[PDB]
A paper describes a structure:
Protein-engineering methods have been exploited to produce a surrogate system for the extracellular neurotransmitter-binding site of a heteromeric human ligand-gated ion channel, the glycine receptor. Acetylcholine-binding protein is a highly conserved ortholog of the pLGIC extracellular ligand-binding domain (ECD) with properties similar to nAChR. Mutations affecting key residues in the orthosteric agonist site at the α1(−)/β(+) interface affect the potency of both activation by glycine and inhibition by strychnine. We therefore set out to generate a high-fidelity surrogate of this α1(−)/β(+) orthosteric binding site using the 2α1:3β stoich­iometry [Fig. 1(a)] by exploiting protein-engineering methods and the thermal stability of acetylcholine-binding protein from Aplysia californica (AcAChBP). Ultimately, the highly stable AcAChBP framework has allowed us to introduce nine amino-acid substitutions that have resulted in a stable surrogate for a heteromeric neurotransmitter site that binds glycine.
Variant II therefore reverted back to Trp164, but with the inclusion of a G162E substitution. The residues now changed (Thr53, Gln74, Tyr110, Ile135 and Gly162) correspond to Phe72, Arg93, Ala146, Ser157 and Glu202 in the human GlyR-α1(−)/β(+) orthosteric site [Figs. 1(b) and 2]. Crystal structures of variant II with HEPES, tropisetron and strychnine revealed that the G162E substitution was accommodated with the structure essentially unperturbed compared with variant I, although now incorporating two charged residues (Arg74 and Glu162) to polarize the binding site such that the principal side is negatively charged and the complementary side is positive. The complex structure with HEPES showed this crystallization buffer component binding in two orientations in the orthosteric site in a similar fashion to that reported for LsAChBP.
Residue numbers in the entry:
A (entry chain D), D (entry chain B): 20 to 224
B (entry chain E): 20 to 226
C (entry chain A), E (entry chain C): 20 to 225
The structure:
Amino acid sequence: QANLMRLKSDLFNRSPMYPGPTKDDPLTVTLGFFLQDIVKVDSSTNEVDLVYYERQRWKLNSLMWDPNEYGNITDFRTSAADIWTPDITAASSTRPVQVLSPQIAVVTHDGSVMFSPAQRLSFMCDPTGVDSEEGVTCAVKFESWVYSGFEIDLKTDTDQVDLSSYYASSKYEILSATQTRQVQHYSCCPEPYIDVNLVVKFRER
Amino acid sequence: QANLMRLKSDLFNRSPMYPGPTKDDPLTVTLGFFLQDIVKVDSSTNEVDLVYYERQRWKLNSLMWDPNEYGNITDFRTSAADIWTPDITAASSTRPVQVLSPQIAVVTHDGSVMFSPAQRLSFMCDPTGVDSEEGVTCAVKFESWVYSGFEIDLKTDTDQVDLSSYYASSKYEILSATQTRQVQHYSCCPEPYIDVNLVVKFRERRA
Amino acid sequence: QANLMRLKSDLFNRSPMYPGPTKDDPLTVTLGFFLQDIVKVDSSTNEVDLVYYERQRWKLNSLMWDPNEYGNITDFRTSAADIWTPDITAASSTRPVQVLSPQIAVVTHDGSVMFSPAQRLSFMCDPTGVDSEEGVTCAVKFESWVYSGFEIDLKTDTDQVDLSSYYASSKYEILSATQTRQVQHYSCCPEPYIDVNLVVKFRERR
Amino acid sequence: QANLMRLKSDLFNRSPMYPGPTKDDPLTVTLGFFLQDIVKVDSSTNEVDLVYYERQRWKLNSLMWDPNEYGNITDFRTSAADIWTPDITAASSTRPVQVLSPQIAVVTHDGSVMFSPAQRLSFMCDPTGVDSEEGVTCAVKFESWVYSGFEIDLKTDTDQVDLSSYYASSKYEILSATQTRQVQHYSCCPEPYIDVNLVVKFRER
Amino acid sequence: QANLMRLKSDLFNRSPMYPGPTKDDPLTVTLGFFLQDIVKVDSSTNEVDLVYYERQRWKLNSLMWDPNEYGNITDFRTSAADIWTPDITAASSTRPVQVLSPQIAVVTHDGSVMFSPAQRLSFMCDPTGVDSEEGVTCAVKFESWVYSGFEIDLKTDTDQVDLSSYYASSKYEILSATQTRQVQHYSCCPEPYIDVNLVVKFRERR
Ligand SMILES: *[C@@H]1O[C@H](CO)[C@@H](O)[C@H](O)[C@H]1NC(C)=O
Ligand SMILES: *[C@@H]1O[C@H](CO)[C@@H](O)[C@H](O)[C@H]1NC(C)=O
Ligand SMILES: *[C@@H]1O[C@H](CO)[C@@H](O)[C@H](O)[C@H]1NC(C)=O
Ligand SMILES: *[C@@H]1O[C@H](CO)[C@@H](O)[C@H](O)[C@H]1NC(C)=O
């Protein structure tokens, strides 16, 4: 405990918080989605509600340490308020995101940070054809609200959405679920626009 | 990072927050609306729900810096809790406005601030005629709740509401959407208020 | 800005907040209601929902200043958390009051404070007869939860509720809306309370 | 106001907050209920919703003063955040208690504190027979969540629930309403566990 | 009171909060469930709502004291904000867990902490067959969100789900209720991931 207290003090009390990336010092953030349940579908309003968690990872040199100097501690957990976190947002949400997990992150000795908030999300989606055999396809884009592709680069570690925690007796069954980095370039402008597109194909079970 | 950390420390940790405008030192705020979706319409209660984001811009001398003194940094991002933001409110909302985006602002070296919160709003609107070809018109005023036109002047950069992010498979299609500066006098108060009136003409999509 | 920063520092950082009125130093608070919309009516539960804002005004000597000493500043805006505010409550609400406006007050150099929160309120009311020509009457009392009439006196400046912000195409139309100072007696206590009774007569816009 | 400011400063700024009762220094808390309205009854979920206010009184030597030393002030009002308050809870609530009044208490010079929060409560109750002439009886227990009867003794000042503020045009009428202290002793342990049982008999009007 | 005030000051004001367990200094946390009511069932969305309380126990050397030095105080109560608490979460909730009790823990002189929050939970469960004699079976997993089995070793304090506080006139009756630790190992990683699985068999009471 003494070792961890000394480590947290050295990281958080001495130096200030990471102020965020700039064009000179950009930051890669990796996203992965873990789908738990398609809870409901509203054809009256074209809204769908998803429960999932979202693994976010980035790496900062200011959060590095030598385990030997701190009783061989290789990682620790801390409140997400104690560190900078990225502003990743669902671009087409229709209600505030409801947080289902504690807001706590894992920091490892190489300066890697992992933050995995569980969420209930309502987003825009026309569910006509969900009651058929072919099903329906909906998509939602995740992006940094205020950082361009020159400051925050988004990527995924895999293209497959993890369905290992997907509830077997959900009202809706998953035909397909992918997560894909998309880069948009406009003729006008030099900076790319980056998003991660979550595409889910599903139908009534 | 060192340069940005020093800059944020100089701006936020040394000086206090901007205390808001006065009659001697008024402030112009520019508003632009970006409509995403008319989510629902309730004829039983005459309430309509809109999803949109709202670009707010203002300029403060207290947030200025010289890029040369901070490694040529021309701008940065910060939590909206770190700065004063204006008290712009929908005057006819029926439920508290729900925030859909992170509360983060962009500050540039000339002291300009840009803050663009995404929002879900329920407001008063009679939707009779939405199922027709002519559609229905609703209006909602946005204004400072407590600053008169002598302290906060509102403007728009354009009169056309941006529909580029509008959801193609919405139940409702937009016939027209304008944003217009107005001057209001209220029974409460002798000082006039400035509002931006968002007027949207829409109907059920025949799809 | 320098002048306003110095003023706010002199008022809020040096002295403590006003601790509230006592029997020796009572306080008058003026209330006006501005009705916006009767949003819904629930006959299954006898609940009605109102959207309105409530203008509250009082005066404190501890919030006075000389404009000459502060660049001719005659007033300013500040978070309602920075000042004492009165504990005015709807006595017959059935749900917590939902706040629709920022919690910000106007303070003027004579020590006058104006605080005007916009609110959605659910309160107890039997709406039988709302679909008729005569309509229905509902009433809700606003009062200090813990200060008697010897500490907080409530008044209104007018007996007519302001309907200038009332939504023209509301499902419900207003036949009458008054705001009236009363004295309220509780079994518990010998001291009377002052309330403002908001009485609204309305019907379906047929 | 100078006298009241000095008094509040002497009580709250100098000493810390009362840390709660112990077995050596127990505390009596008195509870009284004032019923305003039975708002709804849900037979689909066996939930009933009540609006009421709850008078809580206790007495602390740490909140005593001599009126002569403070301009003859015999009492004052203060935010409930400035003082310790008891952890009285409805044991059979089905939703978080919703607070309908400002969180403010009255403190008197003998160290008595009165705190009377207005509340909307959903609690477990089977309302079968509410539409009959006999009506239906429901009960809800109030207790300290973490203090045993050796630390907090609960009592009522009367056994009759005050119905003087009960809404005349409620959908439901009250046939009877009592509030009664109950003590439970367990084989395991020496300490008694105390609750106040609020029993309400009612029917459709 | 003086003794308890001095104790709380020595524990909380001098030292910082316990920063959480590590691989070098792991922590055992016990969970036990006390089921109060199955409030509702939604077959349209396959959601069920449960009211229960959850007894959590762990032990820390940083919260130890000698009763002789503090007027023979063997235990006290404190706000859960004053201490580290474990990050136990329902992994299959569909809405944020609603807290029904005050957030207060019991700390004893050997450094044992007991924290028992009451909660309303909506979780994923297909209730087809709840209206039958056989009933329906649902499960909900509880786990530390961010601590592996190398940091928090999570277990049950008892083998029985306590049904003694279960409401007799609930719409639903409990046929069976178990609580069980489960361990998962992944190809990626050496550390085990632990959950406690609450399995409840129930049906409509008629
Ligand atoms: C430090 O921990 C690592 C991780 O398991 C292990 O390989 C090593 O044996 C430990 N070293 C010491 C000095 O304890
Ligand atoms: C800032 O810009 C000037 C001119 O382009 C350049 O010489 C200088 O190296 C820059 N300063 C830093 C610290 O990068
Ligand atoms: C503004 O300040 C100057 C300071 O000398 C004073 O002469 C003047 O009277 C003030 N304005 C008003 C309207 O009082
Ligand atoms: C602690 O216990 C001793 C007996 O061993 C007793 O005499 C003493 O009074 C106790 N202390 C307090 C403060 O009660």
